[PDB]
Design a binder for this molecule. Structure first.
Ligand SMILES: CCCCCCCCCCCCCCCCCC(=O)OC[C@H](COP(=O)([O-])OCC(O)COP(=O)([O-])OC[C@@H](COC(=O)CCCCCCCCCCCCCCCCC)OC(=O)CCCCCCCCCCCCCCCCC)OC(=O)CCCCCCCCCCCCCCCCC
Ligand code: BCL
Ligand SMILES: CC[C@H]1c2cc3[nH]c4c(c3C)C(=O)[C@H](C(=O)OC)c4c3nc(cc4[nH]c(cc(n2)[C@@H]1C)c(C(C)=O)c4C)[C@@H](C)[C@@H]3CCC(=O)OC/C=C(/C)CCC[C@@H](C)CCC[C@@H](C)CCCC(C)C
Ligand SMILES: CC[C@H]1c2cc3[nH]c4c(c3C)C(=O)[C@H](C(=O)OC)c4c3nc(cc4[nH]c(cc(n2)[C@@H]1C)c(C(C)=O)c4C)[C@@H](C)[C@@H]3CCC(=O)OC/C=C(\C)CCC[C@@H](C)CCC[C@@H](C)CCCC(C)C
Ligand SMILES: CC[C@H]1c2cc3[nH]c4c(c3C)C(=O)[C@H](C(=O)OC)c4c3nc(cc4[nH]c(cc(n2)[C@@H]1C)c(C(C)=O)c4C)[C@@H](C)[C@@H]3CCC(=O)OC/C=C(\C)CCC[C@@H](C)CCC[C@@H](C)CCCC(C)C
Ligand SMILES: COC1=C(OC)C(=O)C(C/C=C(\C)CC/C=C(\C)CC/C=C(\C)CC/C=C(\C)CC/C=C(\C)CC/C=C(\C)CC/C=C(\C)CC/C=C(\C)CC/C=C(\C)CCC=C(C)C)=C(C)C1=O
Ligand SMILES: COC1=C(OC)C(=O)C(C/C=C(\C)CC/C=C(\C)CC/C=C(\C)CC/C=C(\C)CC/C=C(\C)CC/C=C(\C)CC/C=C(\C)CC/C=C(\C)CC/C=C(\C)CCC=C(C)C)=C(C)C1=O
Ligand SMILES: COC(C)(C)C(=O)C/C=C(\C)CC/C=C(\C)CC/C=C(\C)CCCC/C(C)=C/CC[C@H](C)CC/C=C(\C)CCC=C(C)C
Ligand SMILES: CCCCCCCCCCCC[N+](C)(C)[O-]
Ligand SMILES: CCCCCCCCCCCC[N+](C)(C)[O-]
Ligand SMILES: CCCCCCCCCCCC[N+](C)(C)[O-]
Ligand SMILES: CCCCCCCCCCCC[N+](C)(C)[O-]
Ligand SMILES: CCCCCCCCCCCC[N+](C)(C)[O-]
Ligand SMILES: CCCCCCCCCCCC[N+](C)(C)[O-]
Ligand SMILES: [Fe+3]
Ligand SMILES: [K+]
Lengths: 302, 240, 281
């Protein structure tokens, strides 16, 4: 049995890591949580510490208010009976206001003004959380890459329940919160628009999703192949190239006729991924605003 | 048509994106060489990028890439054929020479620093408050080689401090000297630690570290290169 | 044409088949036994597809398609323009993919690295073989497989999907998607992190893996670690493709009905089902 490095063979533990300081305000950073021997076998064993600020609490608040506002309504539908609640859990839905209410806030609670409430709560919670991904990096003096990549996911999310329903003139065009319900909205969207497969952006969105899975499978497997040369320490192979970096590049050169660099591969990474929700956000935004039917469009445009 | 515009606009963006991504990935190994080390004629459609310079932490200098490409070591290979595209046979002992699967890059002769400027890797005796938290503790386990002979015993675990993980097993030999075995190349069992990559006669060959409180980027590469190479090279003495 | 460091690694050996014979390079490409096999399976396979494009009377990759032998031919053979072609092409394909993975194993052996990559490749080959082989043979017709053509295979998807209703209701499919949707999130992060640290704010020193662990603990209160995230995205990836093959192998075989209806087992559990109120009450 040759050892493949998928699971840690022997864990070690040492003093809880409180982490680098730099310009971070340490008054807002919590204390260390427990150590999971379970987690240990795969990644780190150390939970925490977690930084929680004025913005970190705002986010963490709204995000729950968003999660409650829905489940309150999910209880309402259950008739406040836990057995039904559990049973019907995927069938519950909080739905956007009826089209007759257009873009107003006038729509009553049981008619979807309760939707708007939770939606607001979401909107606050997400951007405030995007606030974090920029700020935590600024504090450590690192790149904003996480902030920008996040922004890419936010894109599709803004298109879906915000930007598009505004351009379509009503909130009813938005996505309902519920497990089976939003699944239907997705499928329903396809039919309404003439088989979304004919949208050239879904064409690409799906390619990048597929490619994200292909590349991270390549990358991940690769680093694990060269981990015996300490491949996982990518940054110090960036500053000083190890045989790990060479053997990596060379597998792929010899296989596919070209290759990457240890900093380079991560640019392939960040992009291939980002472009999923990047493209796919456009594809949606264009649907119903500009192109009503993707089949139809597909006959007149290439 | 708006969408038709968007999508055209995208295919043009994506071409330039692939250009940028490819040029960026040319910051090492390029310009290409012929087998004799002279710059090759055909470099491909992609130009070298305008160079960048990294500021290494803790006064370690800088790195500018792309840059002058030299191996900074002697290569123990000679051509096996009269034309391009053929294997290059080692002249000497490829393990000792450091070629093929035993190849090593000549990287800095200083150890890797953690965020605070202390060495990333210390043996666990010198690691303060570091202890095995799970799995079988290998320390004191006899080490067997692919030829199923005892190569000596495990006298410590060299651990990565900031990632809190094992890296090497320091192994003591017959003559009482120790070598570092990469963790990824050892299978710690119930009754022993097993190394498939090397037979026992090859252990004494494992490149040695100078200050044995620490190990350096160059010394890791020499040891990791060495042990990995043994797979191909120790093949005659490997049973099973 | 080699890379500045390439030559030292170009020693002989590692071959599974044939010894020193095919062991050499063409440009950057390594050859090996299986380099040739791949070529041949790909060559043939392309030629058949090229010659299957004539029988249809087009060269238009948008138009060109090779359909499986119809349900009538079952699991047996079929005439060439009648779906025999697709059958051999699949043999050529399955050949050239497996010749590829094995060529990748021979490159692993020369570079003294782990087999992790062609191991992971095999998960994509298995998804494919599910679709063109394991599913059809369990269902008894090569016609159940997807046809080879750009849109025409996407037709196959939308038709195969809606046969079972909204396909979203396949639970194994929901699981597969959760992996695909996660993995892309894990790719976006992993890339954004490593890049942020190697490309910090103006004039600052290259950050350290310690800053990486810090940024995440600062963020979500945990960091999986660098050996972790690699195991992670590799798992999230193979996971994704595993449940993808799984979702499709149960479909049409052990479950042929409308997928949404499958979820009644939960609703119709005795300790709720007849309680008034709710959605299904
Ligand atoms: C539309 C949808 C909008 C959605 C927004 C999502 C944005 C996606 C961001 C992905 C990030 C990866 C790149 C790294 C990065 O930008 O550095 C971080 C950096 C952080 O600042 P810092 O911490 O102080 O310093 C860190 C270093 O500088 C760190 O520096 P660095 O070296 O790591 O990064 C350098 C970076 C710096 O430069 C940039 O600012 C990047 C610009 C990317 C634009 C993305 C466009 C989206 C696609 C749609 C286009 C049309 C399609 C239809 O350069 C690039 O990444 C190269 C861009 C490649 C472009 C390809 C060209 C194609 C067209 C050419 C035509 C010719 C073809 C002929 C045929 O941030 C910025 O550079 C700004 C980015 C802001 C993006 C959000 C905009 C919101 C509105
Ligand atoms: C209308 C249709 C239905 C539907 C019906 C189906 C059907 C039907 C199928 C899927 C499958 C999938 N669908 Mg679904 N799907 C729907 C809705 C969705 C939605 C969504 C947002 O709504 C998503 C995200 C998904 C996602 C998914 C994944 C779970 C899966 C695709 C990945 C995969 O299988 O990899 C598998 C990857 C491969 C097989 C890659 C093969 C690569 C091989 C090994 C080598 C290629 C070499 C190449 C030729 C070389 C090129 C030569 C040069 C070098 C370039 N579906 C709708 C409701 N879905 C598929 C699945 O699970 O299959 C197992 C599938 O069959
Ligand atoms: C191509 C873009 C990909 C992407 C990228 C991406 N996502 C990101 C980022 C990036 C780059 C971040 O930086 C950011 C992040 O912080 O990641 C960790 C994030 C993020 N992506 C997330 C989710 C997410 N990403 C998705 C997808 C994607 N994101 C794409 C694949 C999806 C999908 C597929 O739909 C989801 C659901 C979040 C984890 C995070 C954004 C955080 C956010 O906005 O939080 C809102 C605020 C809150 C306070 C959360 C409220 C919590 C409640 C809703 C649940 C409560 C559960 C509770 C009952 C449990 C109790 C505890 C138990 C232990 C008992
Ligand atoms: C069934 C209906 C048809 C369909 C529809 C469809 N697909 C879609 C959409 C729609 C309507 C999108 O909007 C989305 C898209 O990009 O469209 C172009 C998408 C898409 N279709 C895709 C794939 C796909 N679709 C397919 C099919 C189809 N899609 C059918 C034809 C198939 C196949 C095989 O048939 C595939 C593979 C993806 C490429 C893309 C979706 C990509 C993606 O990752 O999107 C999900 C991510 C987000 C919405 C980002 C959210 C980011 C944060 C804001 C999350 C915050 C969450 C937090 C507040 C709480 C979380 C809790 C805690 C963890 C904190
Ligand atoms: C399992 C995780 C993901 C994955 C992993 C993965 N893929 C891989 C690997 C790995 C680990 C490799 O090592 C290998 C590689 O070399 O990557 C660059 C590869 C690879 N994955 C590839 C493609 C690919 N992977 C996909 C998916 C995935 N691969 C999963 C998401 C997809 C999708 C989404 O559909 C595609 C298209 C190739 C780039 C490469 C394999 C190259 C190869 O084997 O080439 C040999 C064959 C030929 C050159 C030509 C074949 C011609 C004829 C023999 C047959 C004709 C085929 C016929 C079926 C045509 C179909 C037409 C379609 C329109 C239907
Ligand atoms: C840290 O390390 C890492 C690197 O290195 C430092 C890397 O490079 C890579 C590799 C990853 C990249 C280079 C990033 C970009 C990659 C993608 C986006 C994946 C998509 C790949 C393609 C679209 C290219 C497809 C080409 C393939 C698969 C082969 C094409 C084949 C030919 C053109 C010729 C075929 C050769 C034959 C027939 C074999 C035998 C040869 C004869 C002629 C006989 C990874 C994973 C890695 O993590
Ligand atoms: C340089 O490296 C880096 C580090 O290290 C130095 C890091 O630390 C990190 C940080 C790494 C992390 C914090 C992890 C990132 C991942 C997430 C933020 C979320 C992903 C969560 C997991 C990996 C585990 C959970 C995975 C899930 C939820 C998928 C599995 C789900 C199921 C099996 C079913 C779910 C149920 C559904 C959807 C419906 C019910 C289905 C029925 C059949 C019933 C990064 C990114 C990194 O870059
Ligand atoms: C016992 O349970 C209790 C009571 C504790 C609970 O609370 C349980 C709670 C539940 C189980 C609820 C769980 C909720 C769901 C299952 C969530 C399902 C939701 C989805 C699948 C989300 C899909 C789509 C989300 C989208 C796209 C949202 C779009 C948001 C918009 C971008 C925001 C727009 C904001 C609006 C419209 C307001 C405008 C005002 C401004 C100023 C911004
Ligand atoms: C996504 C993973 C989430 C893990 C979050 C763990 C947070 C650690 C909080 C520990 C709190 C410790 N203390 C002393 C402040 O109570
Ligand atoms: C809020 C908790 C304070 C930090 C203390 C952490 C202790 C780690 C948990 C004990 C480890 C036991 N075990 C079995 C996981 O090894
Ligand atoms: C998101 C991280 C997932 C963590 C899952 C950890 C799985 C534990 C695996 C058990 C290890 C096998 N074992 C005990 C023999 O070592
Ligand atoms: C408390 C929610 C925060 C404000 C965001 C949502 C606007 C309020 C909508 C409630 C509708 C009330 N009313 C009377 C119109 O039905
Ligand atoms: C960053 C890597 C780039 C990979 C590019 C993937 C190309 C796939 C092209 C598919 C085109 C689909 N469609 C519908 C637009 O024609
Ligand atoms: C969609 C992913 C494929 C992108 C192709 C990248 C460029 C291929 C040519 C690489 C150049 C190789 N070379 C000759 C410079 O060494
Ligand atoms: Fe990486
Ligand atoms: K100690």
């Amino acid at each position: 049995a040759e050892y493949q490095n998928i699971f840690t063979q022997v864990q070690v533990r040492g003093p809880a890591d409180l982490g680098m300081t730099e310009d971070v305000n340490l008054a807002n950073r919590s204390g260390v949580g427990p150590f999971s021997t379970l987690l240990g076998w795969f990644g780190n064993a150390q939970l925490g510490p977690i930084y929680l600020g004025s913005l970190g609490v705002l986010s963490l608040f709204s995000g729950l208010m968003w999660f409650f506002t829905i489940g309150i309504w999910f209880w309402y539908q259950a008739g406040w009976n836990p057995a039904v609640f559990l049973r019907d859990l995927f069938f519950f839905s909080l739905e956007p206001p009826a089209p007759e209410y257009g873009l107003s806030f006038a729509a009553p609670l049981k008619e979807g003004g309760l939707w708007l409430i939770a939606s607001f709560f979401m909107f606050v919670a997400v951007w405030s959380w995007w606030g974090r991904t920029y700020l935590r990096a600024q504090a450590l003096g690192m790149g904003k890459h996480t902030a920008w990549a996040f922004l890419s996911a936010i894109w599709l999310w803004m298109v879906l329940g915000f930007i598009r329903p505004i351009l379509m003139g009503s909130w009813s065009e938005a996505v309902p919160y519920g497990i089976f319900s939003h699944l239907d909205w997705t499928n329903n969207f396809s039919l309404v628009h003439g088989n979304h497969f004919y949208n050239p952006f879904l064409g690409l969105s799906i390619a990048f999703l597929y490619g994200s899975a292909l590349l991270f499978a390549m990358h991940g497997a690769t680093i694990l192949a060269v981990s015996r040369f300490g491949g996982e320490r990518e940054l110090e192979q960036i500053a000083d190239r190890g045989t790990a970096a060479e053997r990596a590049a060379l597998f792929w050169r010899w296989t596919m006729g070209f290759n990457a660099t240890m900093e380079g591969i991560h640019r392939w990474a960040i992009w291939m991924a980002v472009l999923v929700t990047l493209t796919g956000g456009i594809g949606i935004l264009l649907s119903g605003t500009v192109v009503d039917n993707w089949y139809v469009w597909g006959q007149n445009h290439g | 048509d708006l969408a038709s515009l968007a999508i055209y606009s995208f295919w043009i963006f994506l071409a330039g994106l692939i250009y940028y991504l490819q040029t960026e990935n040319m910051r090492e190994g390029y310009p290409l060489e012929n087998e004799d080390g002279t710059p090759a004629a055909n470099q491909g459609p992609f130009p070298l990028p305008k160079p960048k310079t990294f500021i290494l932490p803790h006064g370690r200098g800088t790195l500018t890439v792309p840059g002058p490409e030299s191996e900074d070591r002697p290569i123990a290979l000679a051509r096996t054929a009269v034309s391009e595209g053929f294997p290059h046979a080692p002249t000497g002992d490829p393990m000792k020479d450091g070629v093929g699967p035993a190849s090593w890059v000549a990287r800095r002769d200083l150890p890797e620093l953690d965020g605070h400027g202390h060495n990333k890797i210390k043996p666990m005796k010198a690691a303060a408050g570091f202890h095995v938290s799970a799995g079988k503790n290998p320390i004191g386990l006899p080490v067997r080689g692919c030829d199923l002979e005892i190569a000596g015993k495990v006298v410590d675990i060299w651990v990565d401090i900031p990632e809190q993980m094992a890296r090497f097993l320091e192994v003591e030999l017959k003559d009482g000297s120790t070598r570092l075995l990469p963790m990824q190349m050892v299978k710690v069992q119930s009754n022993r630690v097993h190394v498939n990559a090397l037979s026992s006669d090859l252990f004494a060959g494992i490149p040695t570290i100078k200050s044995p409180t620490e190990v350096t980027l160059l010394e890791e590469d020499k040891i990791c290169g060495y042990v990995a190479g043994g797979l191909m090279y120790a093949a005659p003495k490997r049973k099973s | 044409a080699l890379l500045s460091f390439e030559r030292k690694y170009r020693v002989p050996g590692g071959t599974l088949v044939g010894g020193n014979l095919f062991d050499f390079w063409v440009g950057p490409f390594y050859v090996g036994f299986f380099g040739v096999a791949t070529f041949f399976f790909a060559a043939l396979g392309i030629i058949l597809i090229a010659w299957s494009a004539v029988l249809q009377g087009t060269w238009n990759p948008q138009l060109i398609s090779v359909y499986p032998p119809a349900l009538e031919y079952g699991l047996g053979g079929a005439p060439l323009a009648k779906g025999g072609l697709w059958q051999i092409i699949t043999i050529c394909a399955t050949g050239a993919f497996v010749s590829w993975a094995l060529r990748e194993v021979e490159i692993c052996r020369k570079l003294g690295i782990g087999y992790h990559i062609p191991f992971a490749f095999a998960f994509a080959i298995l998804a494919y073989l599910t679709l063109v082989l394991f599913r059809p043979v369990m269902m008894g017709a090569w016609g159940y497989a997807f046809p080879y053509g750009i849109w025409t295979h996407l037709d196959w998807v939308s038709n195969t999907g809606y046969t079972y209703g909204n396909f979203h209701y396949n639970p194994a499919h929901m699981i597969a998607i959760t992996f695909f949707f996660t993995n892309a999130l894990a790719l976006a992060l992993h890339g954004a992190l490593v890049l942020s640290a190697a490309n910090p704010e103006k004039g600052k020193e290259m950050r350290t893996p310690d800053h990486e662990d810090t940024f995440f603990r600062d963020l979500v209160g945990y960091s999986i670690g660098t050996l972790g995230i690699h195991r992670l995205g590799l798992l999230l990836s193979l996971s994704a493709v595993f449940f993808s093959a799984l979702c499709m192998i149960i479909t049409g075989t052990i479950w042929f009905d409308q997928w949404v209806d499958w979820w009644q087992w939960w609703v119709k559990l005795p300790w709720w089902a007849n309680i008034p109120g709710g959605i299904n009450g």
